[PDB]
Design a protein around this ligand. Structure first.
Ligand code: HEM
Ligand SMILES: CC1(C)[C@@H]2CC[C@@]1(C)C(=O)C2
Length: 405
């Protein structure tokens, strides 16, 4: 299902990439996307899939477009257009200068100081989860750790019942990796049905949780509206439920396959932070975009007002112009160049939280379970979308090679 080419698009710029179902998926999602960076592909292409949209394939172009909010607006950041149209999260569907006041509040809730405060819980849960799995000699990493770990921490931050995970998680997934089961607008509405009553409750009778802080916050010297709060909280939930969860599975799949990298971290722990950056470069996983506010000529291509462009965060660090041997994991790279957390005014506020969850997992898993592999005859499947993911990750290990702490 290819849309007919608009008049302004040169046929030589056509490359029919389906961000939801790329051709090479079997090879790995990162590898499936990297097809865009082969020599046969121009820097900026038009795909006929998902209603037709531009895709910038190079880190330089991506960064430039992200900086340029004048031309590339956040108003409609999702593809397909119906999803980007329905999208009304704050701060993300706003451009500067409006965005700024909303970002400042969201930072209050997810920023550095919050991470510092939650550090002990993060360490506590990681350890508990790992210790609980250790003696089993096998898990489903995705369901057994990658989901519960970051999710439960978010549920704690937010003050929401763990009971709601399944329902919330389902809705979040519909937004980033649509099934066909529900439209974005439907998913969005259902999440909103969930939040509304809670926000109300928390405006009346505030807590210390993230939702209470957001619901009662000040923006541009006046109180936030219920609608604004609902829209911020909807974003926090997606970021909380759908990001770190998927990343940890890519990273663990890779460590399950690379004894030598596991070892390096065990002996030279000072390298964990560097390693984290390298893994965030190699297993980058987000791809959203922007909408042209006007006609604009960008790197010699004519963009029409209302055209959508995908600016895949994932691709910058995979670009050979940015990192030599991009597909190779190297913990001692002199420069780890990526835009995994985004770029420009919408740089991820949850990044500090994400890095602390990642480093804790690596240190604590490797301590207890130094030696593991993917289960014999398990075929690992990746899924593509706005945020890419791993379907299931069967791991096996000999309990006798583990260490209790
Ligand atoms: C592996 C982990 C994560 C990655 C790769 C990531 C990636 C991103 C990207 C690429 C953006 C920019 C989107 C744009 O420009 O349209 C973004 C923004 C954002 N993310 Fe993160 N995210 C992660 C984890 C988190 C977490 C844990 C949270 C907190 C719940 C979160 C909250 C946010 C917020 C609030 C913004 C919007 C900032 C604004 O628009 O000013 N993210 N994230
Ligand atoms: C692209 C994102 C990763 C960022 C945080 C959650 C997400 C799906 C958004 O809608 C903005």
């Amino acid at each position: 299902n290819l849309a007919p080419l608009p008049p302004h698009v040169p046929e030589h710029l056509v490359f029919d990439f389906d961000m939801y179902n790329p051709s090479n998926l079997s090879a790995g999602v990162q590898e499936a996307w990297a097809v865009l960076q082969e020599s046969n592909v121009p820097d900026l292409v038009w795909t006929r899939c998902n209603g037709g949209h531009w895709i910038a394939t190079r880190g330089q172009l991506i960064r430039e477009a992200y900086e340029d909010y004048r031309h590339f607006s956040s108003e409609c950041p999702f593809i397909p257009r119906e999803a980007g149209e329905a999208y009304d999260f704050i701060p993300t569907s706003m451009d500067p200068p409006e965005q700024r006041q909303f970002r400042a509040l969201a930072n209050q809730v997810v920023g550095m100081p919050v991470v510092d405060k939650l550090e002990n819980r993060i360490q506590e849960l990681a350890c508990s989860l790992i210790e609980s799995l250790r003696p089993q000699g096998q898990c489903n990493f995705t369901e057994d750790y990658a989901e519960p770990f970051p999710i439960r921490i978010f549920m704690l931050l937010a003050g929401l019942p763990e009971e709601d995970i399944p329902h919330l998680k389902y809705l979040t997934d519909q937004m980033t990796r649509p099934d066909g089961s529900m439209t974005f607008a439907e998913a969005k509405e259902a999440l909103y049905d969930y939040l509304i009553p809670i926000i109300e409750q928390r405006r009346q009778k505030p807590g210390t949780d993230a939702i209470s802080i957001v619901a009662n916050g000040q923006v541009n010297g006046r109180p936030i509206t219920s609608d604004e709060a609902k829209r911020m909280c909807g974003l926090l939930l997606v970021g909380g439920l759908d990001t770190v969860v998927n990343f940890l599975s890519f990273s663990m799949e890779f460590l399950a396959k690379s004894p030598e990298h596991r070892q390096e971290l065990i002996e030279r722990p000072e390298r964990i932070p560097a390693a984290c950056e390298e893994l965030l470069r190699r297993f980058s996983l987000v791809a959203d975009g922007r909408i042209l506010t006007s006609d604009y000529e960008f790197h010699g291509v004519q963009l029409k007002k209302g055209d959508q462009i995908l600016l895949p965060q994932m691709l910058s660090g995979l670009d050979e112009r940015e990192n030599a041997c991009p597909m190779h994991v190297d913990f001692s790279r002199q420069k780890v160049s990526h835009t995994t957390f985004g770029h420009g005014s919408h740089l991820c506020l949850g990044q500090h939280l994400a890095r602390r969850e990642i480093i804790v997992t690596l240190k604590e898993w490797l301590t207890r379970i130094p030696d593991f592999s993917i289960a014999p005859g398990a075929q690992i499947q990746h899924k593509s979308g706005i945020v890419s993911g791993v379907q299931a990750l069967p791991l096996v290990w000999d309990p006798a090679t583990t260490k209790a702490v």
